[PDB]
Amino acid sequence: PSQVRQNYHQDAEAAINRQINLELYASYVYLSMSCYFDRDDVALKNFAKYFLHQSHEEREHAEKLMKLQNQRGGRIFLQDIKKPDRDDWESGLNAMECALHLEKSVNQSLLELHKLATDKNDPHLCDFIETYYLSEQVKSIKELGDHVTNLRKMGAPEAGMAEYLFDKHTLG
Amino acid sequence: PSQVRQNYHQDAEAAINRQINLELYASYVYLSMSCYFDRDDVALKNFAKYFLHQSHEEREHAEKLMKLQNQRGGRIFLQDIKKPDRDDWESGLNAMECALHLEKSVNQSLLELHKLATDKNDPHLCDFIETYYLSEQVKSIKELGDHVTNLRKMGAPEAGMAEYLFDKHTLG
Amino acid sequence: PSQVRQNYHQDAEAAINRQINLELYASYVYLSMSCYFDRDDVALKNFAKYFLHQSHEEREHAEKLMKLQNQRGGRIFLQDIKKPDRDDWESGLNAMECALHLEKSVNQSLLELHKLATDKNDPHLCDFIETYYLSEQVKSIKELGDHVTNLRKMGAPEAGMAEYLFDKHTLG
Amino acid sequence: PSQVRQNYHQDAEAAINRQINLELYASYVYLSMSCYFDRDDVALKNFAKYFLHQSHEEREHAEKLMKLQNQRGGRIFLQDIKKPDRDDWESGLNAMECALHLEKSVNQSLLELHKLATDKNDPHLCDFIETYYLSEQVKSIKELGDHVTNLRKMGAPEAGMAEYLFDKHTLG
Amino acid sequence: PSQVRQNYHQDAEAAINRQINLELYASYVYLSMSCYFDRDDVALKNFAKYFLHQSHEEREHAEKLMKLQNQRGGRIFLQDIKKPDRDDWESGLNAMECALHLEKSVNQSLLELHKLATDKNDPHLCDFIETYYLSEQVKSIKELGDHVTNLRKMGAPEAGMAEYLFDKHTLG
Amino acid sequence: PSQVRQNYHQDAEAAINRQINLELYASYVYLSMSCYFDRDDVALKNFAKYFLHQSHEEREHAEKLMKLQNQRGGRIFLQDIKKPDRDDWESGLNAMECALHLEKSVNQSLLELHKLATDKNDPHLCDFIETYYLSEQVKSIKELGDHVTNLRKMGAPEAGMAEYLFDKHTLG
Ligand SMILES: [Fe+3]
Ligand SMILES: [Fe+3]
Ligand SMILES: [Zn+2]
Ligand SMILES: [Zn+2]
Ligand SMILES: [Zn+2]
Ligand SMILES: [Zn+2]
Ligand SMILES: [Zn+2]
Ligand SMILES: [Zn+2]
């Protein structure tokens, strides 16, 4: 056992490693979205900027989970980062909806991780999750829902000016 | 065909996708090294800082390659980022030697990519590789070789103060 | 022979003169586009500003080729700058598509010139082209492709607000 | 008819297009002279700087005429820019004398253009010419005559230090 | 083999060592020229300043080639720096012409070195040469050709005021 | 005889030429040492920095001796700069000991030169040597002796951390 390990369950360590992988996967998916929006035939530069920022934030979340794992005496075990479900995100609205789905799944993972930490009476893990991940996930989900709502209202994807003006105004 | 595609061969596109994957893998391996050095039983904070910086630089290299793919009209196809070869890097000297090996493999990949771009008479791809990746890889390999040499001379791994003082002086 | 002439083939000199003429022609075409967009019945001031900037950049590129010709001991031979293929560019989308075509032709000429310089084993000419012209041409082609894509999606030319809003947001 | 056009005769529009071409040609001739003086076997850097400045001024004059054409509702019709009368300008004195001849021909063109605008009772065109082109051409012709006089007195072209010292002193 | 050595041929290493010696020799020749022009019986202070600057630049070029040799894992082997072909450079024009010849020989050496690096498919060596040495050599050769041309026209060496005024104006 | 020559014996001129050559040789040897310490398998960056500084100081000494030669009306005669005694300096301690030996030999040459200048009753040459070279040589020899003493005490070369820590602390 690590000399710093205290009130850290093996299940908590495994769940934290799984969350690390899921946050790295979310970063990779956001990177894919950014790449798609940097294409010449998509050409939505603020969409690409937004999703690159999301990718970097998800990488920061994974690194924070790594720091937590190390601070608690748990051992980080990295896995293959699976490729995103697709490379063609097909629209700004569709990419925003997929980002909403991704952040909802990340939130669900964080929620079951918090449930696990509460089962093991690991108050530091619970506080870490609810302080650094749950509030940020709620904010991200709300922002993505706002983006999806505004894009749907403007008429995206059918309204070709909707995605462009959302790119200029909301994402610029 | 992309409207911007011109003098960009399918083989070059595939090679750049493979290079993007390899740069992402190198970033992941550097992240693993940083995680290992952030452990309480390793506790080399400047080693972890160094390898986190390397991970971020490799991620930036992958992002630049994807920007290149989009600029040339090629389509980025992301793959699974494979798990690093191991999670326990066993020493500062061993981690630096593995980083040397990784950067030499990345350099070899970039070199065969440049060879391919020269075969296809793609001067822009060749210049991009040369100005952004080959010089950087040579600098990284030379720096890692210096690190390995200094750690070996100091007595690492067996000299327990060698890695600590390398951490404080070279990496501080 | 010029006292500075060294490893500079006559064919390289002729190709550089032809590139000078082509870049002067591109400057002239961009000037025509700017003039068209300054018309009262077109009245797209950021389109005119964009194409005037492009004409000035192409003139700078021609002057850089002139400086290269003189630096290598080659003699600059200027030719008639042919008038642009049209004076009425009939839309912002059409002008951007024609600018894309023009920059792709300029890139093709630069690629042929680089191929020639590689055949004559003129490394300085190759480095000059790939350092000052190939990357800039790739960037210009990618930017023009983005412009064309955004204008097409917005609904240009038929969507009369598409060109106006692109003028205001992308080009402003 | 253009919605802004009024008191703008077709002959005035044609004369303005001809002046556009003539000023573009003057810019091209100044470019040729600058190129000649940037040669290694001429090596007169302030002569080249002076004639590049003249080329840019003539380009600005052509663009101002373009702006005038558009402001008046006339349509700019661009023509082939004929190559300069020669590529070897044979001396600093000879290039200065040819620049004098060129600016005097440009002024003569502007004078017959002003005569035409006066015959057609186009006071705005007359004012435009006289405030932006006639005084500028008189100043340019006087400066070129001063340059020619000083170079002739110094002993150019035969006095090889005359052009060098004029380059350093008058043009530096 | 060096731990950093990768895609670095023995012939490339030998050619780099020869170029190091050639750049040190060029620095030594420029030092000789500076010494000659600092003499009381020639006493051209800006000529001496110019050639001392050239000597220091050639020394910096040799040091950069040394850094390249070490970065690539090649071993620097220094040779005797041969004395300059003569100690009396006989005039400002003669020294400028000899400097032109020296820089053209250095350029030819760099060109055959680039040919060698291209034969061995060493893209990093080719890029290093073309970005740090070929453009600088072309600029130096053009500048020296300009100097020789201006000195020849001014009347050097026979015109004793020519070298003095070139010293004051071009070199001051 | 130079118009400036006065109380400057031919033997003093020859001795100063020999001293210029010896200072250039010392600069070359220091450059070799710096190159050795910039190698990946040596990787002592402050040792390389120190010896590069020493080579630049020795080059300044040679340049100042040549300025002295020219001020006195003597003619500088440059010779081949002999290759350094070896390319592999095999340790920081060994390189510092060889630098001590080199500076002691340079000091002995300067002392012989001062003895010669005293024999010829050349007070300006004696003052020049003792003002710019003897004090500097004594300081350099004392500093090199301190470096050698500290390296021997620390346990260099066998103590592999001795050279590293001397690099970081004394030379950093
Ligand atoms: Fe709007
Ligand atoms: Fe003067
Ligand atoms: Zn997250
Ligand atoms: Zn990389
Ligand atoms: Zn261009
Ligand atoms: Zn004009
Ligand atoms: Zn050089
Ligand atoms: Zn010295």
Swiss-Prot record, chains A, B, C, D, E, F:
Subcellular location: Cytoplasm; Cytoplasmic vesicle, Autophagosome; Autolysosome
Gene disruption: observed consequences: Homozygous mutant embryos die in utero between 3.5 and 9.5 dpc. Heterozygous animals are healthy and fertile and do not present any apparent abnormalities. They show slightly elevated tissue light chain ferritin content and 7- to 10-fold more light chain ferritin in the serum than normal mice, but their serum iron remains unchanged.
Molecular function as annotated in GO: ferric iron binding; ferroxidase activity; identical protein binding; iron ion binding
Record PROSITE patterns: FERRITIN_1 (PS00540), FERRITIN_2 (PS00204), FERRITIN_LIKE (PS50905)
Protein name (Swiss-Prot/TrEMBL): Ferritin heavy chain
EC number assigned by the record: 1.16.3.1
Taxonomic lineage: Eukaryota, Metazoa, Chordata, Craniata, Vertebrata
Key word Coiled coil present: no
GO cellular component, one term: autolysosome
Binding site for Fe cation 2: 58, 103, 137
Keywords: Acetylation, Cytoplasm, Cytoplasmic vesicle, Iron, Iron storage, Lysosome, Metal-binding, Oxidoreductase
Subunit structure: Oligomer of 24 subunits. There are two types of subunits: L (light) chain and H (heavy) chain. The major chain can be light or heavy, depending on the species and tissue type. The functional molecule forms a roughly spherical shell with a diameter of 12 nm and contains a central cavity into which the insoluble mineral iron core is deposited. Interacts with NCOA4; NCOA4 promotes targeting of the iron-binding ferritin complex to autolysosomes following starvation or iron depletion.
GO biological process entries: immune response; intracellular iron ion homeostasis; iron ion transport; negative regulation of cell population proliferation; negative regulation of ferroptosis
Family per similarity comment: Belongs to the ferritin family.
InterPro entries assigned to the protein according to its UniProt record, in alphabetical order: Ferritin (IPR001519), Ferritin-like (IPR012347), Ferritin-like_diiron (IPR009040), Ferritin-like_SF (IPR009078), Ferritin_CS (IPR014034), Ferritin_DPS_dom (IPR008331)
Record bears the keyword Oxidoreductase: yes
SUPFAM superfamilies: Ferritin-like
Domain Ferritin-like diiron: 6-155
